[PDB]
Design a protein around this ligand. Structure first.
Ligand SMILES: NC(=[NH2+])c1cc2c(I)cccc2s1
Ligand SMILES: [Ca+2]
Ligand SMILES: [Cl-]
Length: 223
């Protein structure tokens, strides 16, 4: 997260870290046995780490659970990143409490102007590489579709939305992929892509979760 602030330990209880010997992506807990992340974060050997703040120190509250299966959306396109969503089923259910809790799925899509909270352990430099030890947060608004399409002509599909600042300076970045964009207590986005990080007129693009609720529900119901 570039230009963000330190969230505070366990203030984002639904945030998870996908780990394979190091942190490579973020995700969101939606019930005690399932997590939603980005399809481009897929790999084998994923351990889901819940209740984290400093990812390099065991401080207490952590729960390390292996993924039993990862379900990448069948129509995921890695060239355009259309349908960039993945569901992970945990080997055992997590113990939910105030530090580990699930986030709700939306019942309707969000409007331009909605202020949301984006979080993660990704890079904090637009020009460079600095990964933090603790979780970073950023409050950012959803932009209008015209501004988004004008910034990335020909690359935005109806399953994506832009959020951020056109002046640059504040944005999500590599390492934040798969993490949550929460607005009014509902999970509306998943960190997907962008041109560099925090560049002027190049906001972050996110997977539009409201378009996938029936799919998530049906898939969880059959697995
Ligand atoms: N500018 C951005 N919001 C992002 C830039 C990236 C990059 I560079 C890699 C992976 C994910 C993201 S999100
Ligand atoms: Ca830790
Ligand atoms: Cl267009």
């Amino acid at each position: 997260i570039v230009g963000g602030y330190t969230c505070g330990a366990n203030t984002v209880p639904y945030q998870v870290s996908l780990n394979s010997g190091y942190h490579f992506c973020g995700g969101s807990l939606i019930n005690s046995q399932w997590v939603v992340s980005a399809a481009h974060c897929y790999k084998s050997g994923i351990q889901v780490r819940l209740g984290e703040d400093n990812i390099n120190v065991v401080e207490g509250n952590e729960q390390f659970i292996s993924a039993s299966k990862s379900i990448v959306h069948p129509s995921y396109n890695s060239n355009t990143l259309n349908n960039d969503i993945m569901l992970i089923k945990l080997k055992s259910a997590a113990s939910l409490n105030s530090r580990v809790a699930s986030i709700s799925l939306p019942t309707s899509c969000a409007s331009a102007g909605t202020q949301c909270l984006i979080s993660g352990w990704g890079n904090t430099k637009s020009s460079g590489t600095s990964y933090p030890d603790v979780l970073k947060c950023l409050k950012a608004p959803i932009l209008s579709d015209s501004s988004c399409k004008s910034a990335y002509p020909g690359q935005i599909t109806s399953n994506m939305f832009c959020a951020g600042y056109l002046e640059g300076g504040k944005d999500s970045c590599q390492g934040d992929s798969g993490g949550p964009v929460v607005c009014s207590g509902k999970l509306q986005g998943i960190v997907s892509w962008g041109s560099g990080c925090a560049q002027k007129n190049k906001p972050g693009v996110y997977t539009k979760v409201c378009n996938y609720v029936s799919w998530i529900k049906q898939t969880i119901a059959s697995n």
